[PDB]
Structure formats: structure tokens, C-alpha cells
Amino acid sequence: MVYSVGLTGNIASGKSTVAEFFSELGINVIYADKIAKELTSKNTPCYQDIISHFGSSVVLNNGELDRKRIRDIIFSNSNERLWLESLLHPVIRKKIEEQLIVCTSPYCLIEIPLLFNKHHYPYLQKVLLVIAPLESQLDRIVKRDHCTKKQALAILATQPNLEQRLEAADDVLINESGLSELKAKVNKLHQKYLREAKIKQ
């Protein structure tokens, strides 16, 4: 229906910044993560199933979901990552399709998770994977998490291997030198996607 580019990134890759640069070029960006939060708002069906599944530990005093805790669980327990992805996939897909129907840009960017199920995103024309070198990731993680460098390395040490996702990706944006070059790279990708969407039916 619409020429769609999947946006993925490893840890502390700079990918939300990449999304913003695409946004600022007039491209419609669909944020699957934002949709997931929406559809796990207080007393939504998925919110209820999540709390019943994981139990009271993932409910803050707020009655809001403990999203930090859930991320920790999802990252360390693959069976739970898959369970949660299976739960949310049907509702998230319906929201994505709504936004695609009203897409006003020449192509669309869909921000999706690093280890996204392809069977759930078979309609993507392209996949873009944003990565940052180890040093850059640590700096980003220490500043965001306020943690020790050795804890950041330990966090990076446990990330999923990218070999398979690097192979599959049509384009890999190495974010290795500041915001200005990042913007320049996004610009060239933008022109590439415009070109390919123009000649693709």
C-alpha cells in the first residue's frame, strides 16, 4: 500500500534522533513504541493481561505499568519477550495500518524493535539499522543511566548479536561522529528512499 522503511537500532544507537531528522524532512514516522505505551495505558485490555501475567511486581503505586521493570524482564527472558510481542502485535498492527492509510508523505518510516518479527512486518520495503560504536554507546549509557562504565559494558555485553540483523538490513547507518554527520547521512538515505519509492510499484 505505502512504501515503508523499518527503522531499527542497537543500544544507544541514536535512532530516535534519526527518526526526528526523517520527521523534519517531512516524512511520516510511525512509532511502534509510542503505540505500545498508548495501548498499555491504565485499564486497557493489554494492560490488564500484562499485570495478570507478570503479577503485582510490574504495577507501580500509580497503577501505571513499571516499564523499566518490564524492559528488564523482556531483555533477560526471551520467552517473555515473545509472549509480550505476541500479545501486543495484533493491536499495534491495527494502529499502524490506520496511520498508513492517512500517510501524507512519499514514503513512511516505521520505528520498530531491533529483533522485530519479520512475519509481523512482511510489508516493509526496506530496513534501516542504526548502530553506534562501543565507545559511543558507553558514553551514552553512562550519561543516561548515571552508572559505572563497567556496568554499561556489562549491559552492552548482554545485547543481542547483530550479525543476522546486520545482514538482513538494506542500509546500516553507523552513527560514529556527532549530530551533524548523522543529519547528513539521514539526508542521503532520504534521497535514496524518495528515488526508490518513485520507481517502485
Swiss-Prot record:
<comment type="similarity">
    <text>Belongs to the CoaE family.</text>
</comment>
<dbReference type="GO" id="GO:0004140">
    <property type="term" value="F:dephospho-CoA kinase activity"/>
</dbReference>
<dbReference type="Pfam" id="PF01121">
    <property type="entry name" value="CoaE"/>
</dbReference>
<keyword id="KW-0808">Transferase</keyword>
<dbReference type="GO" id="GO:0005524">
    <property type="term" value="F:ATP binding"/>
</dbReference>
<dbReference type="GO" id="GO:0015937">
    <property type="term" value="P:coenzyme A biosynthetic process"/>
</dbReference>
<keyword id="KW-0173">Coenzyme A biosynthesis</keyword>
<feature type="domain" description="DPCK">
    <location>
        <begin position="4"/>
        <end position="201"/>
    </location>
</feature>
<comment type="pathway">
    <text>Cofactor biosynthesis; coenzyme A biosynthesis; CoA from (R)-pantothenate: step 5/5.</text>
</comment>
<comment type="function">
    <text>Catalyzes the phosphorylation of the 3'-hydroxyl group of dephosphocoenzyme A to form coenzyme A.</text>
</comment>
<dbReference type="InterPro" id="IPR001977">
    <property type="entry name" value="Depp_CoAkinase"/>
</dbReference>
<feature type="binding site">
    <location>
        <begin position="12"/>
        <end position="17"/>
    </location>
    <ligand>
        <name>ATP</name>
    </ligand>
</feature>
<dbReference type="GO" id="GO:0005737">
    <property type="term" value="C:cytoplasm"/>
</dbReference>
<keyword id="KW-0963">Cytoplasm</keyword>
<keyword id="KW-0418">Kinase</keyword>
<dbReference type="InterPro" id="IPR027417">
    <property type="entry name" value="P-loop_NTPase"/>
</dbReference>
<keyword id="KW-0547">Nucleotide-binding</keyword>
<protein>
    <recommendedName>
        <fullName>Dephospho-CoA kinase</fullName>
        <ecNumber>2.7.1.24</ecNumber>
    </recommendedName>
</protein>
<keyword id="KW-0067">ATP-binding</keyword>
